[PDB]
Design a protein around this ligand. Structure first.
Ligand SMILES: *Nc1ncnc2c1ncn2[C@@H]1O[C@H](COP(=O)(O)OP(=O)(O)OC[C@@H](O)[C@@H](O)[C@@H](O)Cn2c3nc(=O)[nH]c(=O)c-3nc3cc(C)c(C)cc32)[C@@H](O)[C@H]1O
Length: 451
């Protein structure tokens, strides 16, 4: 129980009621430093621990696909927490009102939340701070090394973040203690889902035949389903991961991102299990570079760059290059709706958008190709960022995520990249040509599957 995982958000006066874990990013009962820390605080105070989750007003900015995935997982989570004699309360509203009122109504003694570097979570925290007088902590339960510990600043390249992160892995990569149950026991989610689906339905993604686009059987939600996906990745896909991770015709990725995004599985758990696996060397190195270095540098990016979703956060070499080509004539301009419908003149791009539309998880390789063409076929880099973020957040199961803003910023603005050869329109941003993908994998097979 390393105290470097927890820090104070606001001092206060400790009450004598239960310890409240405001769960947000880490929707799981196992392998959860925020829940474990909350339980430990409760034990020292001779009080029970309680979990609260905010069903916020912002769900209408995404789709049924993410709402159902999240809420079905929370239904499973209710059962698991109740087995530990830990009650869970699901508050309909936004956190500033709901958390403050709950703290008062339930005589909470201490408030704890998990860590997200996203603007909306920081918006939420500000309102909560103004409505409570009890101590308020946050625990990094999402990263192996706490984000504010891995580095003191924005890291401009993987190769400057990687040695700092790896220097800290011996301390922070460790097993989880078991969650001790509470000593004694202190509108349903199905109805909430019903109400939300009703409100979301007019905006549901449909084919011209009015049949829905989304296929919900590619990733079953919840902690138990996530563990099976991790186990099948290690048993069946990890050996080939190094060779096949850049081939979107092969189903050889871990497929863990939807579970990692909602915190239905701990990435620390995944890393421990992968470290212990005997697998092809090269493959384990490649996978750990993604789930450790690239995932946690995305939290580094959002945490230390307030404007992480804007042009101003790009590196200076990229801002200069993009500005110098701002007035170049674009080969094409597509509207947000033309991008959304997969109606560019590039069949590889359109197939990547159809994979996103139908499965809610675009292959990692084509996400890079996809975002870079939005830069190439939009009026400005600012508009490209707007369009890519809109589509990523609306349709990825793993979207609205530091990985997303960081991966889009890499794609369009060269964040965590270097300058490449100068081209018109896109400047020195790394280019990914259609013909280059053809030399890389079977583009025709990918197009057939998603068309
Ligand atoms: N590139 C990258 N950046 C951050 N974190 C990453 C990245 N690649 C992998 N990971 C993290 O590692 C695990 C395991 O990786 P894989 O098994 O290789 O991948 P999957 O879980 O099956 O597939 C998800 C993966 O394709 C994406 O994580 C990346 O493409 C990154 N990425 C997002 N990741 C998100 O979680 N949410 C988003 O909204 C993302 N949006 C984008 C947008 C764009 C334009 C790009 C280029 C990437 C991207 C992964 O689960 C992850 O934790």
């Amino acid at each position: 129980m390393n105290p470097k995982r927890i820090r104070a958000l606001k001092s206060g006066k400790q009450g004598d009621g239960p310890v409240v874990y405001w769960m947000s990013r880490d929707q799981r009962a196992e392998d959860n430093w925020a829940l474990l820390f909350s339980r430990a605080i409760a034990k020292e105070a001779n009080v029970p621990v309680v979990v609260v989750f905010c069903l916020t007003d912002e769900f209408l900015e995404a789709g049924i696909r993410q709402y159902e995935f999240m809420l079905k997982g929370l239904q499973e989570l209710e059962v698991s927490l109740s087995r530990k004699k830990i009650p869970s309360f699901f508050l309909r509203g936004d956190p500033g009102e709901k958390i403050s009122r709950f703290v008062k109504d339930y005589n909470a003694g201490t408030l704890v939340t998990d860590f997200s570097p996203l603007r909306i979570k920081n918006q939420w925290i500000e309102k909560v701070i103004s409505g409570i007088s009890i101590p308020f902590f946050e625990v990094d339960a999402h990263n192996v090394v706490p984000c504010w510990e891995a580095s003191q600043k924005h890291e401009y390249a993987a190769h400057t973040f990687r040695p700092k992160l790896y220097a800290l892995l011996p301390e922070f990569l460790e097993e989880f203690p078991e969650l001790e149950p509470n000593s004694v026991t202190p509108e349903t989610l199905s109805d909430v889902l019903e109400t939300g689906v009703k409100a979301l339905l007019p905006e549901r993604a449909l084919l011209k035949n009015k049949d829905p686009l989304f296929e919900p059987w590619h990733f079953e939600p919840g902690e138990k389903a996530a563990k099976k996906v991790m186990e099948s990745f290690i048993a069946d896909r990890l050996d080939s991961y190094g060779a096949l991770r850049n081939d979107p015709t092969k189903n050889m990725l871990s497929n863990l991102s939807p579970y990692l995004h909602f915190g239905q599985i701990s990435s620390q758990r995944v890393v421990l299990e992968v470290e212990k696996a005997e697998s092809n060397p090269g493959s384990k190195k490649a996978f750990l570079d993604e789930i450790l270095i690239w995932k946690e540098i995305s939290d580094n990016f959002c945490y230390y760059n307030p404007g992480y979703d804007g042009f101003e956060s790009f590196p200076s070499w990229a801002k200069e290059s993009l500005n110098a080509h701002r007035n170049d004539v674009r080969s094409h301009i597509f509207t947000l709706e033309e991008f959304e419908a997969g109606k560019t003149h590039d069949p590889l791009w359109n197939a990547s958008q159809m994979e996103l539309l139908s499965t809610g998880k675009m292959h990692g390789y084509t996400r890079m190709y996809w975002a870079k063409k939005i830069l190439e076929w939009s009026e400005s880099p600012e508009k490209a960022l707007e369009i890519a973020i809109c589509l990523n957040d609306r349709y990825e199961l793993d979207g609205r995520d530091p990985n997303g803003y960081a991966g889009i910023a890499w794609s369009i603005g060269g964040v965590h990249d270097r300058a490449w050869g100068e081209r018109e329109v896109t400047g020195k941003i790394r280019y990914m040509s259609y013909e280059g993908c053809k030399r890389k994998f079977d583009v025709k097979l990918y197009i057939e599957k998603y068309s």
